Amino acid sequence: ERSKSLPFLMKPKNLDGSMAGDVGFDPLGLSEINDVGVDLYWLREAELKHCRLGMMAAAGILFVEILGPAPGFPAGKSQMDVFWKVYAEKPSLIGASLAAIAILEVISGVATTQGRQNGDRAPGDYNFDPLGFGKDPAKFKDLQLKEVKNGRLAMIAAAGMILQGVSTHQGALENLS
Amino acid sequence: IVAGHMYKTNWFLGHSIKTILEAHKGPFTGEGHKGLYEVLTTSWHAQLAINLALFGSLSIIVAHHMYAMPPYPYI
Amino acid sequence: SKAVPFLEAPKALDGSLPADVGFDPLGLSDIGFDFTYLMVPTKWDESRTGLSALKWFREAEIKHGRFAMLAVLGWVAVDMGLRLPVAKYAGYNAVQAHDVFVKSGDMTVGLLAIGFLEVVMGAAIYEMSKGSDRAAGEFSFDPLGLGKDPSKYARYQVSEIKNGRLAMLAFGGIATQAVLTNSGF
Amino acid sequence: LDGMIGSSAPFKNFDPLGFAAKADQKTLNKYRESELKHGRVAMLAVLGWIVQEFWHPLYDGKLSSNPLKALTEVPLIGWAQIFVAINVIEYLQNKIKELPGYRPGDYLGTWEWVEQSDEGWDSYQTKELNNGRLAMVAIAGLIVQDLITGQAALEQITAGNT
Amino acid sequence: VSFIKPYRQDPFVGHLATPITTSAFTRAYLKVLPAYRPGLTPLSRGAEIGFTHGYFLIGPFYTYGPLRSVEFSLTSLAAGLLAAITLLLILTVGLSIYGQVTYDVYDNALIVKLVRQMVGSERTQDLPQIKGTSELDTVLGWQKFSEGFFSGGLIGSIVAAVGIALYSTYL
Ligand code: CLA
Ligand code: CLA
Ligand SMILES: C/C(C=C=C1C(C)(C)C[C@H](O)C[C@@]1(C)O)=C/C=C/C(C)=C/C=C/C=C(C)/C=C/C=C(/C=C/[C@@]12O[C@]1(C)C[C@@H](O)CC2(C)C)CO
Ligand SMILES: CC(/C=C/C=C(C)/C=C/[C@@]12O[C@]1(C)C[C@@H](O)CC2(C)C)=C\C=C\C=C(C)\C=C\C=C(C)\C=C\[C@@]12O[C@]1(C)C[C@@H](O)CC2(C)C
Ligand SMILES: CC(/C=C/C=C(C)/C=C/[C@@]12O[C@]1(C)C[C@@H](O)CC2(C)C)=C\C=C\C=C(C)\C=C\C=C(C)\C=C\[C@@]12O[C@]1(C)C[C@@H](O)CC2(C)C
């Protein structure tokens, strides 16, 4: 009856055990929202998209700062400020990436709403397993848990890197030391 | 934006225009505003009357404030 | 009552709460306002029966006591030295460290973190108002485990509330006096 | 000190000196008439005191903003007209007092419409009475302060003579 | 409570009992006016009405006439007085013709009872009908009312002229 994460709180009604990373940590009861097209399905899809985006962004920042930029690309070690140097010399790359992300996000929203309507697609599912790393069950649950935990950690990390780069105008590991 | 969070729509929060109107009675006005909510939610003509009157008054106020305080450069 | 004998009792200080002696001359434990509405302004839930002002006051008193105990520990620590093993914390007492650290962008971080914890535990308070069995000040935080043996739990309860009252008054004195036992006005 | 209107929460049926415990209905009606007249006159007097202090458009300015000083500056032929108007009003009130069903302070004749009074009507009458009492105390304080100090309300407050 | 009700418990009259039509202030104020004050003969009502009306009528004529004067002028006062008196004469002519064409009665509050009791099988409108029971609603009553209005108008206009002269001279 009590949430596993917060023993002083009752179990959130909509979070039983199903989703990976579920420990009952919903103090504000946001999982019970059923308005403005927002429900547990939409919240989970948003959480998974945030997890994946944060993982990609943190990996990119760390890669560029440690191993350096790719040939022909600007340096500076400040990832929040090197973006304007890339846009100053290769605006077409940024524009094409933005257009591609826009199209993919329109497709993602359509897929989310459709899967919410005629329930056949789990939240965050895009059938993207080209290498077959999660075919069999009893490993899919473990992979989902790993992805969720890594994505939450990378969300926090990427938000921290964004704020550090905006404020200190220095590199992430530069702030570290 | 602040004024937009006034009327109850889908949560237990905000006002009901029916309850506001029905509470505004008086010794001189009998039942007061009881039934006005039903009038303005079932008649397009009443809404058009109110909106058009206030809209024309707003247009005249705009006309006054325009020349009174010119809001555009070199106008 | 057991204190201020010429006043019988407020009305609600029956004894169901720990550390109860009956001291409430102003009868503050009888206000009909459910202070959970200071958090959730509307009834929101149809199951929100309501929270008595006495239980809200007990939660507030326990929280105040814990805050004051930690506060006097910190203020006494910075009077006798004991700076964090990092730069930018040199010596600037306690009457001036607050402002200089509010300037240096970390008191805001502390505000954010404390507010996060406060929001979670206030959600706990709101669930208590909704009708959860959780008692005031009970966050089920017993990691080391010195909370079993119900007699020990009750003794530690009364101990915590009495120590919190003492620490509230002691912090009031310390901040008002600008410390006399370990520093000067 | 009866089922009369005017009993509020802080002191219900406030007759500490027992003026009403021995009086008959006629004396109590007289007391209510006096209280209501004093309250209305005092509300007018307080509002006039303040407004005159910070606004005296008439008489082409002049008429020093301090009350109890403009009292001796009005042309004294405008005093006569105000006196005559008050007198005619009170003659009309006297004529009203003999109308059937008359109530002590009721010069609007609300007894014609208000049979079986509500709680809102009683509450509004009590509101008028309490505002009148507060204005009586306020105008007494205003006159006494202006007499002893010589400064008006917003002038004494502004300087800080408190 | 409600402060507007049907007049005299008749929901079909073209009237309402508002806090202005049937208020105690309205009752007393209209009952102290000369037109409705009890105990006044029609001549007395006319005299008082004429006095008040001439008194306030001389004002606009003297102040804003064709012969004004920012100072006090006897010619301006005489012009205003004559204009007020002639206006009172015109009003008295109107009153006289109105009373001539309106009523045919010499003693009211009786003829109505006589025709409600002893039958009124005549040309009607004199025996029967008869609107109003006041003494002002007779040929004799209205004639004396007009006479009083005219005399009181003259007297009040003269009194107001004297007062205006005194105010302009000694003040
Ligand atoms: C009410 C509690 C409280 C508060 C507000 C402070 C505030 C402060 N202390 Mg401090 N301190 C306290 C208690 C407290 N102390 C106690 C009890 C001790 C002894 C253990 C110390 C020991 C101490 C040292 C040794 C030093 C300070 C210093 C400082 C100052 C720098 C920190 C800063 O800028 O904000 C940072 C942000 C915060 C302090 C907010 C606290 C947020 C915490 C970390 C969140 C987690 C709390 C924790 C998990 C509670 C567990 C309960 C529950 C979860 C079960 C600042 C004025 C330094 C200084 O220079 O002072 C002059 C310094 O060197 N303190
Ligand atoms: C007891 C009430 C009372 C008395 C005795 C006075 C006396 C005075 N006022 Mg005054 N005044 C009052 C109330 C009063 N005021 C109120 C309530 C207001 C607010 C509107 C004002 C606003 C006011 C201004 C703005 C000025 C004066 C001025 C003056 C002085 C010159 C007379 C004049 O022009 O009056 C003018 C009065 C008015 C314009 C408003 C009077 C409205 C009356 C009080 C309400 C209706 C009365 C009605 C006939 C009787 C009630 C009916 C029913 C209840 C029975 C004189 C000392 C003048 C002066 O020289 O100032 C120093 C001046 O310029 N007064
Ligand atoms: C209606 C809708 C879409 C939809 C739908 C459909 C289509 C109807 C289908 C479904 O049926 C429903 C629904 C709702 O899904 C809405 C669209 C979504 C919006 C409104 C898009 C918002 C995206 C904004 C982002 C993601 C911007 C991020 C900015 C960054 C800045 C980066 C910086 O580097 C910059 C530039 C400067 C540097 O110095 C530092 C920083 C600041 C870090 C980080 O990235
Ligand atoms: C949109 C796009 C790029 C957009 C870039 C933009 C907007 C950038 C604009 C800017 O930089 C400028 C200009 C100047 C700056 O100052 C301003 C900005 C704004 C910064 C590229 C698309 C690029 C699109 C590409 C490359 C598409 C390739 C498609 C292929 C190969 C299709 C193959 C198939 O069609 C067949 C053959 C058979 C079918 O049956 C099956 C399939 C497989 C679908
Ligand atoms: C008055 C008070 C407590 C009074 C208690 C009383 C009377 C109790 C009386 C009783 O117990 C007895 C005696 C006996 C019992 O039988 C009866 C009662 C009746 C129960 C506490 C004040 C408490 C007052 C407090 C705590 C004030 C704290 C102020 C602080 C901390 C300021 C912090 C700063 O941040 C600023 C604002 C600015 C920065 O620049 C500088 C610093 C200094 C850092």
Short mmCIF file of C-alpha atoms in Angstrom, two decimals, chain C residues 1-10 20-25:
data_model
loop_
_atom_site.label_atom_id
_atom_site.label_comp_id
_atom_site.label_asym_id
_atom_site.label_seq_id
_atom_site.Cartn_x
_atom_site.Cartn_y
_atom_site.Cartn_z
CA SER C 1 -4.21 20.15 32.73
CA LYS C 2 -0.72 19.22 33.90
CA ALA C 3 0.70 22.71 33.24
CA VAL C 4 -0.99 26.05 33.92
CA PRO C 5 -3.41 24.34 36.35
CA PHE C 6 -5.90 27.23 36.48
CA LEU C 7 -6.84 26.50 32.85
CA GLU C 8 -8.52 23.12 32.36
CA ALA C 9 -7.49 22.24 28.79
CA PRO C 10 -7.65 23.73 25.28
CA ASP C 20 1.61 16.30 25.68
CA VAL C 21 1.40 18.17 28.98
CA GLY C 22 -1.57 20.41 28.16
CA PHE C 23 0.26 23.73 27.82
CA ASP C 24 -1.74 25.89 25.41
CA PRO C 25 -2.99 29.05 27.16
#
